[PDB]
């Protein structure tokens, strides 16, 4: 990063325990995601650092997948910058680090904050949009609760699989509301009959359910 | 964390152990209970730090419960904040870090002292209210002291559900002993019964209870 | 502790490997006992540090048991201080850290050496007087030696279990002398026939036996 | 340890590895043999330090044997100390740290140089005289070189019992080779026999013994 | 390594992790690929350092292959070195560190800059040309995309054998995509076929290939 | 070692991970051999340091074997120094550290570079000339290749066992050439028919074979 302008390479042990953690819990752990967010906002990065971090971390397949969704995000961001009002004087190759304006490590020491947040958002989104090994064609009406089942651990499996088959943030977050009230057992569904019929403002709909019907055990 | 404002992230070594401890022992070990507030009282945090720390650490089932109770405590707090004398000008989304004025790292570096401790106090209760993924939380009279079982281990199973299900602190310290020998082991209740009301000044009545009950099981 | 007056909190890794060691070998290991003695005499502690150390270490059951025997030791020490010749101007709440003379961390920075050794002896005794999981009603005349059995490893199991069922230091240390000469096999008992009949001074009675009859193998 | 007197304890990290090594290899590995005297010659110790270190580390069966031989060596030492010219004024309980003048940390900070090395020399022999908890120590002619077995491994099984059962150092270096080929493997004794008395100056005769014996087994 | 000449060795901790990583993952993980050149570009090495590092790390089967290709690259390099304009005066055994003038540590401290980078460039290719001890390296048409299998994992199995079997760098970047869909999965080839020649400027054609191929298997 | 003259003892963790590595992979690993070379050339050692390093590392059997081949190397080096032209004014006891010229640690601080390289070569050779547990009488015409066998992993087992039964460097390195061409399967032997009949200069004969016939897989 930069302090007051030079480059400082990372300490070696960070790559070691990062490789350890991704090897143990996959590239889409909730653990390593916020680890990436912490190391992202905690330092001032250039895209070549993102190249070293990505190539130093995964199998070759996930590395190239990261490269591809990075490329598509570059094109999307460039179209939105040219659609901006007024348009943004930021190209694609400044966002990728190829070309005689941005080839070297010393060239990228003099970027600006809009590029910082832009590469931050786009590489974070690139990490969010990776698949993983392990495949099964998902059908929503196959998973349901059982007797004496703890309520949040039931809805957690519905929470996690919802971001797989739906790209839109809104489309996945509306159907979990519907699948929550149906796939609940009727004794827990009995608790939501006043809550269903009046959705409250200043509040997440799932958040009201979990702190509503907590006392159903066995 | 802020300092004298730059937001420095945590170390990579700061979080791998934290991810280790939750799978090794759980979310409410006494070890991580005194580990969390050490960081909370040696540093000075913004709500996005907790957004990092919980999402990096919990399970998907636990993290949703954390987010559920986190926004739930805001409703109890903001009613206290609005009717104070003098009334303070702090709204809902200033707590949650959402909205136009609270969703960047540059924004959250510009907050006063009197917001921070409310975030700490609500986050501690949020961290305490998590359920383990083994089961749900049982009721009060669903669990009592077992037969041919030790005494002081089962009375430890009350203070946790007291901190879980009860808000007021001195209510917790008074419900437990008045639930202690009420459906306890009756052979132990013989020794326990003549000790009622024999408390000198400022001591745990449960202390002399387990002092008396030596243990007969095994 | 204090150097020349401030408070310094402990490093985090000490609690980590302490929790590791007690989890591996129990709270009454010979290992962790002298670890407690080393960290006890190696630093200048206040009772609130003992609270953090105890609560940061065990299951809830052992923590409250520690609290109880701590309380009983406070009462015993207070009775002996009032029985002292002349009596000692040291109360109970100075030894416990509750009350407006001794509530805060900064209040306990100005104690004196008699309180230091008093809290040292009494918390050490509190750790010595803990039980553990694992129960069996002990009967002394059930364990005995066998053929080709190594002599010190035979008497070690008699050494360790002797402090369980007897609180008095003298009563447990006299009966092991008797059980040593009887539960030995006659070929090793043959070696002690000059040693039995004249107990030597300046010497422990078991110590003479072990460096007497070492050469009985097989 | 003392310094320029304050008694600073060891680190917590100083002892966990020490507890690791005894269960990992034993009490008289060559590794901990050179580990112990390194601390003993880089620091300056009181007898209560050894009371800490042994009780933190050994088994209950080992610790009693250590305490047994520790007081046993005092009887051989104090006869040498009383009849010296000039006679030194150091008694029994000054060695053991017991009694009114030697049982506090404030007391043991007030000792001269000429006590310390005697404690070190007696403690090294005490640490050497421990028996492993697998069995007892066999006799001399109970063990000899096995048939179809390597040569130089079994001759290593003599120097340990020499240091165990013999006090005088140059007696140990002369008993071993005069016990070496006396009931060794007789086919190897054919090659060994014409090498007697062929030692030039200041070398191990056993060196040329294992030089000659190439190894026939397997 | 040299400095401002004394040859300082590496740390002991520098190499145990390196020995750990090869048995943990292999000789050409991406992790050690970016680990090696970090040392190679943060330090300045002589050929005897690589003699240390490979022999300390590989298997006996791997180390001989490394030594085999290491001397093999010298023949291609020295023909370039002899016919240059101006011709440089560097011979064979100056590369290999053998002979009267290059086989001591005092000798190799006396070399110029323009030798060093050739050693680095040849050693990287030498480290890349190693075969794993599971099997040998297969041919080109022995392996293609499998049936009911993911797409972008199997195309990763081409760039490695490209770097293995091909010397010229831009030949590698052009052989792979012209071998990509040639015996790939034909149902995927239906979507792949209309994308030929649609490359704007300076991008991976394989990127849009795996962009198109979503994945049908499983 | 020495910097500008004192002695500095090693850090304790170096002995720890050295004992770890030799315990895992034996004293004749390719790993630990170059570790010894790195720590050898990386520092300025005295023979007493070699004593501490050797005694701190192995079983007693390997330690005494090291001592013996050390002794024989002293005698060989002394005969060659007296056979030198002019002879070398370096004795045996300067090379061993016994005697009133070389008894102490402070005495060995003032050696010279010929002694440095002499003790380096001779202790390295002492480590090379150790046997190990695990015995089997070797016969060369028992091991051969199979179908689809990877060629370098076949010859690696012939490479490693060749230094066991032959002490001469030339005698073992000539017979592996013969056993290479015979014990190869005829399809790989088919590749060497132009290479057999003209051995190339500036090249190792095995090195040409491995980079000749690499493409025989299956």
Secondary structure (DSSP) of chain E? -----------SHHHHHHHHHHHHT-TT-HHHHHHHHHHHHHS---HHHHHHHHHTTS-HHHHHHHHHHHHHHHHHHHHHHHTSSSPP---HHHHHT-STTSSSHHHHTS--HHHHHHHHHHHHHHHHTPPPTTS----STT--PPTT--STTTTHHHHHHHHHH---HHHHHHHTTTTTSSSS-HHHHHHHGGGTT---SS--HHHHHHHH------
Tell me the count of A-E CB pairs closer than 8 A: 57
- Using a CB-CB cut-off of 8 Å, the residues of chain B touching C131 are 215
Contact A36, E128 (CB under 8 A): no
Kindly list the distances between the CA atom of residue D202 and the CA atoms of A81, C165, D198, F206, in Å, as whole numbers in the listed order: 87, 60, 12, 47
Partners for D (CB, 8 Å, 3+ pairs)? C, F
Structure tokens at D129: 């005289």
Q: What is the DSSP letter of D197?
A: T
Backbone torsions φ then ψ of D183, nearest 5 degrees = -135, 50
SS3 E49: helix
Place of tokens 């270190």: D53
Structure tokens at B67: 């987010």
Is B204's Cβ below 8 Å from some Cβ in C? yes
Q: Within its chain, how far is the Cα of F166 from the centroid?
A: 14
Q: Which residues contact C123 (CB under 8 A, 6 or more apart)?
A: C40, C47, C50, C70
Angle at the Cα of E103 from the Cα atoms of E102 and E109, rounded to 5 degrees = 60
**Ramachandran assignment for D26, one of left (phi > 0), alpha (psi -120 to 50 degrees), beta (any other):** left
- Best probe of the F interface among D21, D156, D209, by most F CBs < 10 A, is D156
Is D43's Cβ below 8 Å from some Cβ in C? no
CA distance F164 to D218: 15
Contact D48, D97 (CB under 8 A): yes
Partners for C (CB, 8 Å, 3+ pairs)? B, D
Chain E: nearest CA to A150, how far in angstroms?
31
Kindly list the distances between the CA atom of residue F102 and the CA atoms of D118, D201, F68, F95, in Å, as whole numbers in the listed order: 27, 16, 20, 9
Report the residue of chain F nearest D148, measured CA to CA.
F135
CA distance B126 to B116: 15
Cα R_g (chain C), whole angstroms: 22
Report which of F5, F106, F15 is spatially closest to residue F56, judged by C-alpha positions.
F15
In chain D, the largest separation of any two C-alpha atoms, in whole Å, equals 65
Report which of C103, A55, B55, B68 is spatially closest to residue E29, judged by C-alpha positions.
A55
- Asked if A34 lies within 8 A of B12 by C-beta distance, the reply is no
- Asked if F206 lies within 8 A of E139 by C-beta distance, the reply is no
CA distance C60 to C46: 22
User: What end-to-end distance do the CA atoms of chain B give, in Å?
Assistant: 52
F210: nearest CB among E58, E64, E135:
E64
- Asked if B153 lies within 8 A of C61 by C-beta distance, the reply is yes
Contact between chain D and chain C (3 or more Cβ pairs less than 8 Å apart): yes
CA distance B162 to B140: 9
Q: Which residues contact D63 (CB under 8 A, 6 or more apart)?
A: C30, D54, D55
Chain B: nearest CA to C68, how far in angstroms?
5
- Best probe of the A interface among B136, B141, B167, by most A CBs < 10 A, is B136
CA distance F130 to A78: 67
Neighbour-count burial for F185-211, b at 16+ CB within 10 Å, e otherwise: beebbebbeeeeeeeeeebebbbbbbb
Q: Within its chain, how far is the Cα of A145 from the centroid?
A: 27
CA distance A138 to F213: 49
- Asked if F12 lies within 8 A of D34 by C-beta distance, the reply is no
Contact A207, B71 (CB under 8 A): yes
Chain A: nearest CA to B20, how far in angstroms?
10
Residue numbers followed by a gap, chain C, C–N over 2.5 Å: 4
Which pairs with CB-CB distance under 8 Å and at least 24 residues apart come from B72-79?
B72/A203, B72/A207, B72/A211, B73/B122, B73/B125, B73/B126, B74/B122, B75/A202, B75/A203, B77/B118, B77/B122
Question: Residues C168, C172, C173, C174: is their CA dihedral positive or negative?
Answer: positive
SS3 E110: coil
CA distance C8 to C10: 6
Question: Residues B48, B51, B53, B56: is their CA dihedral positive or negative?
Answer: negative
A64: nearest CB among E31, E35, E156:
E156
Place of tokens 């190829």: A98
Report the residue of chain E nearest A61, measured CA to CA.
E153
- Using a CB-CB cut-off of 8 Å, the residues of chain F touching E52 are 34, 37-38, 41
Q: How many CB atoms lie within 10 A of CB D124?
A: 14
Structure tokens at D167: 């006090």
- Asked if B30 lies within 8 A of C71 by C-beta distance, the reply is no
CA distance E25 to E34: 14
Contact B60, A159 (CB under 8 A): yes
CA distance D40 to D53: 12
Cα R_g (chain E), whole angstroms: 21
Residue numbers followed by a gap, chain F, C–N over 2.5 Å: 4
In angstroms, what is the resolution? 4.3
CA distance D89 to D83: 11
Is A65's Cβ below 8 Å from some Cβ in E? yes
Kindly list the distances between the CA atom of residue C84 and the CA atoms of B74, C9, C90, F125, in Å, as whole numbers in the listed order: 57, 35, 11, 74
- Asked if E159 lies within 8 A of A15 by C-beta distance, the reply is no
CA distance A27 to A31: 9
Alpha-helical (H) ranges within chain C are 12-25, 30-41, 47-55, 60-82, 113-128, 151-160, 169-183, 186-189, 205-210
Cα R_g (chain D), whole angstroms: 21
* HSE, side-chain direction, 13 A CA sphere, residue A14: 13
Is D146's Cβ below 8 Å from some Cβ in F? no
- Best probe of the A interface among E152, E198, E214, by most A CBs < 10 A, is E152
A56: nearest CB among E34, E160, E203:
E34
Q: Which residues contact B68 (CB under 8 A, 6 or more apart)?
A: A204, A206, A207, A210, A211
CA distance B27 to B45: 20
CA distance B104 to B93: 13
CA distance E45 to E35: 15
* HSE, side-chain direction, 13 A CA sphere, residue E163: 14
Contact between chain F and chain B (3 or more Cβ pairs less than 8 Å apart): no
Angle at the Cα of E173 from the Cα atoms of E168 and E176, rounded to 5 degrees = 115
CA distance E131 to F214: 10
- Asked if D204 lies within 8 A of F19 by C-beta distance, the reply is no
User: What end-to-end distance do the CA atoms of chain E give, in Å?
Assistant: 52
Neighbour-count burial for D87-103, b at 16+ CB within 10 Å, e otherwise: eeebebebbbbeeeebe
- Using a CB-CB cut-off of 8 Å, the residues of chain E touching A61 are 150, 152-153, 156
Contact F161, F132 (CB under 8 A): no
Q: Which residues contact D101 (CB under 8 A, 6 or more apart)?
A: D93, D94, D107
CA distance B157 to B144: 9
Residue F43: Cβ-neighbour burial (10 angstroms; 0-12, 13-18, 19+): middle
In chain B, the largest separation of any two C-alpha atoms, in whole Å, equals 65
CA distance B62 to B53: 13
D156-165 and F60-82 helices cross at what angle (nearest 10)? 110
Cα R_g (chain F), whole angstroms: 22
CA distance E213 to E218: 14
Q: Which residues contact E70 (CB under 8 A, 6 or more apart)?
A: E96, E122, E123, E126
Please give the full DSSP string across E70-106, using - where no structure is assigned. Answer: HHHHHHHHHHHHHTSSSPP---HHHHHT-STTSSSHH
Method: cryo-EM
CA distance C152 to A96: 73
CA distance E103 to D170: 46
CA distance B54 to B63: 7
- Using a CB-CB cut-off of 8 Å, the residues of chain D touching F65 are 152, 210
B61: nearest CB among A37, A41, A152:
A152
Is E82's Cβ below 8 Å from some Cβ in F? no
Structure tokens at E35: 């680990």
Structure tokens at F41: 């050339």
Q: Within its chain, how far is the Cα of B52 from the centroid?
A: 19
Is A16's Cβ below 8 Å from some Cβ in E? yes
Kindly list the distances between the CA atom of residue C114 and the CA atoms of C40, C73, C89, C197, in Å, as whole numbers in the listed order: 15, 15, 11, 44
- Best probe of the A interface among B8, B23, B64, B96, by most A CBs < 10 A, is B64
Report which of C129, C144, C146 is spatially closest to residue C181, judged by C-alpha positions.
C144
SS3 A139: coil
């Amino acid at each position: 990063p930069v302090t007051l302008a030079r480059y400082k390479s990372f300490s070696i042990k960070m790559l070691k325990d990062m490789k350890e953690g991704v090897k143990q819990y996959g590239p889409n752990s909730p653990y390593m995601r916020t680890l990436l967010d912490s190391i992202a906002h905690g330092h001032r990065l250039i895209p070549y650092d993102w190249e070293i971090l990505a190539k130093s971390s995964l199998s070759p397949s996930q590395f190239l997948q990261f490269k591809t969704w990075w490329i598509d995000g570059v094109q999307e961001q460039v179209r939105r910058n040219r659609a901006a009002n007024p348009p943004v004087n930021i190209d694609a190759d400044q966002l990728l680090g190829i070309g005689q304006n941005w080839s070297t490590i010393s060239q990228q020491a003099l970027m600006q904050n809009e590029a910082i947040e832009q590469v931050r958002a786009i590489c974070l989104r690139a990490w969010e949009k990776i698949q993983d090994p392990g495949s099964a064609c998902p059908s929503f009406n196959t998973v349901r609760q059982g007797s004496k089942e703890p309520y949040p651990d039931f809805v957690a499996r519905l929470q996690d699989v919802a971001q797989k088959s739906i790209a839109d943030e809104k489309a996945r977050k509306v159907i979990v509301e519907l699948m929550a009230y149906e796939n609940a057992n009727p004794e827990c569904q009995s608790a939501i009959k006043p809550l269903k019929g009046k959705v409250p403002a200043g509040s997440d709909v799932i958040s009201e359910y979990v702190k509503a019907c907590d006392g159903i055990g066995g």
